[model samples]
Target: SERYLLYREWAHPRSIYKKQPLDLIRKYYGEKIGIYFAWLGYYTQMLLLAAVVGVACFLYGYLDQDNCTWSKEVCDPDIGGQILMCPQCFWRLNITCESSKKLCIFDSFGTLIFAVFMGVWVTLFLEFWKRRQAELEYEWDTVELQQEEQARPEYEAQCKCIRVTLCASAVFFWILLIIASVIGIIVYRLSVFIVFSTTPQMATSITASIISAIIIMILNTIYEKVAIMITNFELPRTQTDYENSLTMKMFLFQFVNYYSSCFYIAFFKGKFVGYPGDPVYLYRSEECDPGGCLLELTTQLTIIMGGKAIWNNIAEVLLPWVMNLIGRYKRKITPRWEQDYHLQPMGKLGLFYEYLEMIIQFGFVTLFVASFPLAPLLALVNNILEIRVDAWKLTTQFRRMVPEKAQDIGAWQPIMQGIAILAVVTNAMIIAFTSDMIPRLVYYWSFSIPPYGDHTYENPYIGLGNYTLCRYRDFRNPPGHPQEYKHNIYYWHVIAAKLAFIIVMEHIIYSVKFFISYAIPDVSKIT
Candidate 1:
């Protein structure tokens, strides 16, 4: 019993001492190491979630084929074979029939939902694969750390090769993805055109496609510059300096890009003038006057500016909070450095930018409100150009600040270059595809429903003159005289515009998730 007591006493102190060092070691390593794992886990989870949602959507589309409860009944098929024809019902009955549930479900909702889900799934999976590749590279870093002396030179050489390979792969993948997205978008647009052949709204889809292509070009340029910058700037010995420099570059890029967008919008709206008989007139003639056209423009500008401010706030304040939340959740297991870092001036600068953006928003709103009927196309073009320039600058900065450790990773440089290229290509494709598809989707879904009134006539006409003046006159109101309802076309155009807006929103979400997973560690706590 005495021996046992002595043994316990001695064992306790040694055990405590050993544990103390191990705990400290773990704390240090956890900060740097565990956070990466968390990031990987988060990325994987997101991919899985997307995949699941896509599958569920697909399945729902397949199963729900009886009634399109989600859509308007007028948009549904009639009792005849003329509109909303259901192939399934036609095949089953060997003739067209009225009130065919199959027409309502299979022709409109099911096919559309299926196509949308497929697109979402494919894009998301590709993104997941890209992230997985990055995570694998991160994991490789752990192995390199253990054999630092032996692996350093070889790893560096390999990283260079990988960078090149990645660049090549990225270019190819992006090209393919863009092509696929474009095809999908074209298909959607074609479908819409079939349904709304007589409307000016058809032009909206085409316009959206053009804008999307432009956006793609801008993103691609940015990616190229970022890749070049990273390749040129990487050094093998200074990690902390590299990170600091990179952060500064990113901040500058974001700030300049945002400010340029604001300025362009403000200038265009402020300078433009709308007058009667002007090309920018919203109404057709002197009799048709819609007041507050300029005011409406101002409201839109304000909304855009407000959105930018919100994004800036998210980047500055919300992002840090998210980091801290993640860190605290994993604090018991991860390292210290990995979880905590000092908030630099750039973080504060982000907040300042938010405030600046709000002020810009006010200016834009005022300008737009006063500029009645004048279009804001110039401002939009400027905004696109600014994004392109910012992307280029960011690429340069990234290349200039490549860390020594990153260089040691076999094929790292090439891989990073590839990633940048892929980001550009894929992003462009998505924009293009979304723009093309939106108009078509709206057109098909809203077919047979006149936007102006509740007329169910296949050939509706607008009354231009009084009956008394035309009673004895040869002038007759022709059936479908206008051939198309301008308001209907405009309504569809608005829907397409809104959808395009959503695509942008989704892209931002995607970018944020990606940046957090790759650039920011999970365990890091920043105050």
Candidate 2:
């Protein structure tokens, strides 16, 4: 209450326009604008760096001796079933193995990519902070500008109630989240250490750890949603149209949030698979070959299982809980005191449908979990199922909750639904096809021997053994020759590319989802 009074005194139009601290306003405004411009500058710099890295890669690929040399002799012995000779020396000795050079180039690219990602993250964070500050200032101004007569005892009481509820809920939510995150981290670390150290069953241990983490994450997500709904109930409803809009927005936002989680698990959280020299290859034959057999097996198994665990947690544990909470809250709730309040029962059939959705969600989660070790086949099924379920729910919910002003909006629901459906379909197809076919594509594109023999020589600036060998028997080849050599393919450039892609994609998806959801009526919109 004291803080509110102070805020009102300082932020009121009369106070701000009359006796306002111009210096403070100017300082903050300058900082905000400066940060925004700085962010743009950093973004441009990163893009330039990316372009330069690309050009360097192209040059490396073009000027390399192996690309020009075809008839070079291979004399190096296979140290560990692969070439052990340095690519530079092998080339100097008129021998061949360029894969090592390619690997070093790729590693450099990865480092650059990481740097760009950090730059983008920092810029985004500063931008978000600026936006938040502006919003807080606006809220303060609103509170301060209100007439004294408008701040009646009843109005003050309501504001106090809302504030108390929000603060309590925020504290509870953060505590719960922190506890869950800590538990997840501890379990993950312990399981991973055990799996890697003692038993050959690394797959099982890794799977267990991932499952634990997913459980915690899903639980945390559900808790957040429920907490939000509870907080929403505390806000006073002002108008029927606003209330309708708020409900729609909340529903759409939650659905998109859940869908994003599913997408992340499927596309990004899984184990990468490919041969020794493939671009996406996760296993290195040297560190993970022969006796590395157990390691590779475990790594693949862990990735597959981790993805499945995330899927399962969402469907089986999270979705069901959400449905149950919604049902419970709906049954126990009373309408707000707004004059235009209109209550509609979800009805027995609605309850049945909710239960059916829960069952379907559970089924898909289980299916994905059980089929994890099956790779491409399971990936296809999961994608199809996700798209179908997401589209079905989006359309069904939109049809049921179309606002009274739907006519004024002129078929916006259909347009939004169509866009969402298209996104789901495209995303699913891309992920399923790409994940399944990437290894094959890598194999097909591989260049095993030198194209020419004498046009270009190896650059010693590249790391030792950094070049490809002609065959497994070339001693001049890098240790773990073919396998290790492929590890660095486009190495640095690829890293930067992937990082940039992720940065761009994340912001794009967030913007799209937020815009679509915000366009719909939601409880927050009414408040």
Candidate 3:
């Protein structure tokens, strides 16, 4: 009676803006569920900060859109229209006219700043969360009482550490399989591009992204069973130990599975696809979409992040609702407790799936945010709805979970820290290699040395009027040079700059993160 009564005050969907009755939740649901909701609510609140900055960065890009002279030149009928490109396939300009303009919106100066901000923001979030968790621990009277971990029944039956080596190989193999599958998709995109003919790059990338999203989901379902089997074989002793082991396995799998596509687009897709004269043909070397891989990466991130959220929400909501409907129709139980037996059961890995979902979403929000600054906004919206949906589900659709104790979000803390560490590298590299910012800057500054038109070298002009085949995206020598299509000095310059950027960005962000983590206390003084 008290449980249902408390739902009105704490868990009702209508109580969206109400401050969570954390003490009441702890009293009713125990510290395990208390902390889960606590973390989710806290995470959602932090996302609010990120979401605002992300929007501002995006807005800055939009405002500075037309200021891009390169984009304007690309779209201008006279300049871009006159140019022809030579790659594996010969193409004229203005085909990617719209794409270049749009790419400017994401690959702007603001993104670099936002990426740096996110690096610092991640540190702040984790540090502050530690303090918040400590506060909750104190408030809930769950402070510092390390419970003895009970061994799993399966583990008591059998155990060995060498199986962990076998598990590692299995994980390695699955990752290889996914990598190979993605390679196959790239080949598919290349083959389909020619067949499709109309808006080739855009169409291929969009379709490929959808396909990647589908494959990611399909592989997720398959890997779920595989990971469980592997963890079971590894035979961790305690339930906590088992979960920690499984958490690492599942997170490793899902991290690669979900983000591999974006990583490919960001770092690998166009980097080695040689210029017109002699093209690189490893898996039929695929070139980036018009401007750079940034646009393609954006498309990839959008589809995967959005699609995953959509499907997960659908399954989370629909499955229980439909099952509960069927259960009520077939019900004939007498007592209230007996009738509740028909409700959907939380599985053995209680709260594991929920934590996994939120963490994967966290990766999407942080890992490749440079390609799509709006990622936090998407995550923010999803999490707000997520908090309510999860609340409503616990209140109505799902059977109550056995109250378990948790010291903290175990394993997830370090997992998040790992992601935060990787996020800096990925974003920095995305800006350097995936986006056209560095190359454009190189073109703007160094390449323009000695002014637009000098008497001696005639080097100032990038796209020449004398030549019909003017420019492609690569930093190769112009048409008839002795070392034509070979990587020029500018190529070397850009590469140096990109590397320098990566090192600079990495050190600065990591330094700030290190300082923040060191400076901030995990718990308050009273604790």
Candidate 4:
């Protein structure tokens, strides 16, 4: 507004949400970078909110310990079975699992509450951010630009050699790609397996380092070869389509290569290596003491995410500047036939890279939020450093990008929604199966109300009998005798129920999200 920007205006800590700074950034850095920063701020803010909540959860630990402690269970081999008290109980004196029949840890009410809270929090954050985003777009004057949305005319590439099927023209090479994916998968698996097999115990840190090395190799060398192979196939007409295809292709390979290995080691590998019933655990612990490889998974995810931030910052800002500094020191003239946008007045810089970064971060939170509640915190820390790094890079390193108007995050809109939906299922499975909350909830059925207002005694039974009198009654049961309360939870039935819940939740969430997005308009009078 005044002199555009004075010297070192950024040092003053102005808000990008401010109209002047917003426009200035868009004018100088491009709408893409501005969009990145906008999302960055949103992500950082929400993550900080989650971090604050995490702090509360940590504090709750002391309260939990004060209330209860885990005592070892003492049960007979094959007689009147030993019993422990229900860690949780009703206020009414009548109950089962109260007598010395079955002992249990206090129910994780804290975790259960947080899971629900996070669900609500994530939804509101995303929804609220949308309204704010609309305001930013309005201030930046991109409302008009969005009305006549059109394609970039600067791109034109067309090829016809697409692999459509197993019998397609390039079928052999398509098969080659699939085969190579298997090979890539094997490479990562074997690397981690060897480390696990030989070491005294499963070393997640060592495995992560190996994976990181492998990722670096794949990104640098393997990906380029795959890209070349894809390039030989049918090309896309538009630059947008062209890059999307390549991105999807590379993403498919990279995802399976990196995340698949992690998933295997965590949930399946140790439990499935030699025999179906008799497992030979790769981890050297005397007892399995299963964490579902959660320790390994969370550690790798955090380390990789943090390292990605550092690596991206270095490549985006430090690397280019370092090259320039060296060039100046030696006074070597660098030539370019098709030079970077930095050498030109205006050139397009697509948001594909930004989209990929965002997608992976979303995966971090949605895919493993239950396993690693602090993932959002790690991501927040990264974005804090990332925002400033990107700012410097845009102003000092890169050339001024062509001025483009984007009213909203276009492709990412549905992509994020889809991921959220998928997370509903993943979260459901993680909570139901891995968290053991379901079994615990089932176990709590051991605490049952009496047939009538009891005379006085709190215990369900007089003696530790063989689960003869303990009866679990669902709502469907009609005045049955107090029998053994163990749940008839078959694996198949649980899976089926989980799938049903996932479908129901997805429908409800998406329906609400759609209605809320429009019905609750941006906090402005103008549509």
Reference-based TM-score, model 4: 0.66
Q: lDDT order of candidates, best first? A: 3, 4, 2, 1
The Cα error of candidate 3 at residue 370, in Å, is 1.2
Global lDDT scores for all candidate models: 0.33, 0.35, 0.81, 0.50
Candidate 1 error regions (>4 Å): 1-50, 69-80, 83-499, 514-527
- TM-score, predicted candidate 3 vs. hidden true structure: 0.92
The superposed Cα distance between candidate 1 and the true structure at residue 202, in angstroms, equals 26
Evaluate residue 143 in candidate 2 and report its C-alpha lDDT on the 0 to 100 scale.
25
Model 1 root mean square deviation, Cα atoms = 21.6
Task: Please name the candidate that would achieve the greatest lDDT relative to the true structure.
Answer: 3
Tens digits of lDDT, candidate 2, 148-213 = 323323334666466756756665565555445544543454446444544223354456445544
lDDT of 4 at 268: 50
TM per prediction: 0.26, 0.31, 0.92, 0.66
CA error at residue 409 for candidate 2, angstroms: 13
Candidate 4 ranges with C-alpha deviation above 4 Å = 1-7, 11-20, 61-109, 143-199, 202-206, 209-217, 220-233, 250-258, 265-288, 329-347, 447-519, 522-527
The predicted structure with the larger lDDT, 1 or 4, is 4
Better of 1 and 2 by TM-score: 2
Candidate 4, pairs of clashing residues = 83-100, 83-101, 83-102, 84-102, 84-103, 470-483, 471-483
lDDT of 1 by residue, 147-205 (tens): 43332242356454575566456545654555554445434444554455332222534
lDDT by residue (1-527, candidate 4, tens digit) is: 33236215641235322323555676666666677667767777887887677546544633563443221122232322333221111111122212112112212445445555566566766677777778777677666723432443432323143343422434346445644654464455545554554422235345554556455435534554656465445544555575556665545444444455445433453333322123234332122212234444555666667767767766766665776566456533444422333332222434455556666776666666655556777777776766665555555454445566666666666667676766656655555544434533433343233433233323424442333323211211223425322223343444455466556655765666566666766575663
